[PDB]
Design an enzyme around this catalytic site. Sequence first.
Site, PDB file in Angstrom:
ATOM      1  N   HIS A  46      -1.871   5.151  -2.377  1.00 29.34           N
ATOM      2  CA  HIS A  46      -2.530   3.831  -2.253  1.00 29.34           C
ATOM      3  C   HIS A  46      -2.268   3.152  -0.881  1.00 29.34           C
ATOM      4  O   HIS A  46      -3.061   2.309  -0.458  1.00 29.34           O
ATOM      5  CB  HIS A  46      -2.171   2.901  -3.426  1.00 29.34           C
ATOM      6  CG  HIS A  46      -0.932   2.069  -3.288  1.00 29.34           C
ATOM      7  ND1 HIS A  46       0.137   2.236  -4.150  1.00 29.34           N
ATOM      8  CD2 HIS A  46      -0.695   0.989  -2.506  1.00 29.34           C
ATOM      9  CE1 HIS A  46       1.014   1.300  -3.826  1.00 29.34           C
ATOM     10  NE2 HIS A  46       0.552   0.517  -2.847  1.00 29.34           N
ATOM     11  N   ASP A  97      -0.238   8.300  -7.804  1.00 32.29           N
ATOM     12  CA  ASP A  97       0.105   7.527  -6.611  1.00 32.29           C
ATOM     13  C   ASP A  97       1.226   8.216  -5.816  1.00 32.29           C
ATOM     14  O   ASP A  97       2.386   7.785  -5.795  1.00 32.29           O
ATOM     15  CB  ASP A  97       0.466   6.078  -6.990  1.00 32.29           C
ATOM     16  CG  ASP A  97       0.216   5.081  -5.873  1.00 32.29           C
ATOM     17  OD1 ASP A  97       0.558   3.891  -6.053  1.00 32.29           O
ATOM     18  OD2 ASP A  97      -0.326   5.490  -4.818  1.00 32.29           O
ATOM     19  N   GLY A 196       4.764  -4.304  -0.045  1.00 34.35           N
ATOM     20  CA  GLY A 196       5.442  -3.854   1.176  1.00 34.35           C
ATOM     21  C   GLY A 196       6.492  -2.789   0.891  1.00 34.35           C
ATOM     22  O   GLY A 196       6.833  -1.983   1.761  1.00 34.35           O
ATOM     23  N   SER A 198       5.969  -0.511  -1.494  1.00 33.69           N
ATOM     24  CA  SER A 198       5.202   0.655  -1.970  1.00 33.69           C
ATOM     25  C   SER A 198       5.486   1.899  -1.154  1.00 33.69           C
ATOM     26  O   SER A 198       5.696   1.790   0.058  1.00 33.69           O
ATOM     27  CB  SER A 198       3.707   0.367  -1.913  1.00 33.69           C
ATOM     28  OG  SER A 198       3.342  -0.671  -2.809  1.00 33.69           O
TER      29      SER A 198
HETATM   30  C1  UI3 Z   1      -0.263  -5.679  -3.548  1.00 33.36           C
HETATM   31  O1  UI3 Z   1       0.910  -6.130  -4.238  1.00 33.36           O
HETATM   32  C2  UI3 Z   1       1.841  -5.207  -4.767  1.00 33.36           C
HETATM   33  C3  UI3 Z   1       1.886  -3.822  -4.341  1.00 33.36           C
HETATM   34  C4  UI3 Z   1       2.815  -2.970  -4.905  1.00 33.36           C
HETATM   35  C5  UI3 Z   1       3.750  -3.428  -5.888  1.00 33.36           C
HETATM   36  C6  UI3 Z   1       4.715  -2.518  -6.420  1.00 33.36           C
HETATM   37  C7  UI3 Z   1       5.647  -2.939  -7.344  1.00 33.36           C
HETATM   38  C8  UI3 Z   1       5.668  -4.315  -7.796  1.00 33.36           C
HETATM   39  C9  UI3 Z   1       6.782  -4.729  -8.737  1.00 33.36           C
HETATM   40  N1  UI3 Z   1       6.596  -5.875  -9.510  1.00 33.36           N
HETATM   41  N2  UI3 Z   1       7.819  -3.978  -8.760  1.00 33.36           N
HETATM   42  C10 UI3 Z   1       4.728  -5.224  -7.307  1.00 33.36           C
HETATM   43  C11 UI3 Z   1       3.735  -4.798  -6.324  1.00 33.36           C
HETATM   44  C12 UI3 Z   1       2.745  -5.692  -5.745  1.00 33.36           C
HETATM   45  C13 UI3 Z   1       2.625  -7.062  -6.161  1.00 33.36           C
HETATM   46  C14 UI3 Z   1       2.342  -7.541  -7.486  1.00 33.36           C
HETATM   47  N3  UI3 Z   1       2.273  -8.873  -7.482  1.00 33.36           N
HETATM   48  N4  UI3 Z   1       2.502  -9.284  -6.187  1.00 33.36           N
HETATM   49  S1  UI3 Z   1       2.437 -10.934  -5.812  1.00 33.36           S
HETATM   50  C15 UI3 Z   1       3.180 -10.986  -4.320  1.00 33.36           C
HETATM   51  O2  UI3 Z   1       3.246 -11.543  -6.793  1.00 33.36           O
HETATM   52  O3  UI3 Z   1       1.062 -11.298  -5.715  1.00 33.36           O
HETATM   53  C16 UI3 Z   1       2.728  -8.169  -5.356  1.00 33.36           C
END
Ligand code: UI3
Length: 246
Positions: A46, A97, A196, A198
């Site tokens: 991704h 992924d 970030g 990921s």
């Molecule tokens: C494109 O965003 C991403 C991208 C990858 C993620 C990988 C893991 C997790 C996690 N909860 N461990 C969240 C993620 C979010 C993510 C999910 N929600 N948000 S946010 C910053 O609250 O809008 C960021």
Amino acid sequence: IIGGEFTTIENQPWFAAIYRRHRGGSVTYVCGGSLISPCWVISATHCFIDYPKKEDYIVYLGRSRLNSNTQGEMKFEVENLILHKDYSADTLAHHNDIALLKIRSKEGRCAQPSRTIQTIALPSMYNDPQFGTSCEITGFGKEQSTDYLYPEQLKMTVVKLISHRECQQPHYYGSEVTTKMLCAADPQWKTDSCQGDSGGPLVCSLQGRMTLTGIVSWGRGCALKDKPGVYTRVSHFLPWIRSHTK
Ligand SMILES: COc1ccc2ccc(C(=N)N)cc2c1-c1cnn(S(C)(=O)=O)c1
Ligand code: NA
């Protein structure tokens, strides 16, 4: 990474910092990755699916800061960008992924192991740690869901593995999380991976050996109650990893 603590590359020497070169010369951080052999970095598809051009990417090993040329760091170009053929993204859930990056210096060489550059062992098939096991995550991802900037210094934290039956509960992710995915979170929901982070590693100590058990993939919010971090279960993809690193 929400919560946790700042760290340096000597604590996570398998961590790869992946950047992208834009038209006009600007370079921005994309995702994390893990060095599994001198010529190979494993990450998440991704991270690259919208810009699948290998010449666009810069990979660093032995780098501790987002905009500092850490002493002993090595810079690489991507010789081969391998994305998983059956990758897809639902509203939340990301499937297959996983991605591979064959790395090469300007002189044509792969990584040279050192005190700040080391490989991470892959898991063996049908051998994942039991639910409740503490594992570590590393990345340059967001410190808070409301932030738009990434931290300048590398971060790490510890989360606990969550069973598939618990992660499939209705207030968690229901049938959206599959057996090819691994859930991990903080029981008090105060620390987690975020945007970030990921492509980065989920490392578990299993039978005394540091192992790449997961790859940061997806989640609903960051450190949100009943919403664990979801990771690509590396043990499922061992036939795919072996075939594409040959
Ligand atoms: C494109 O965003 C991403 C991208 C990858 C993620 C990988 C893991 C997790 C996690 N909860 N461990 C969240 C993620 C979010 C993510 C999910 N929600 N948000 S946010 C910053 O609250 O809008 C960021
Ligand atoms: Na920096």
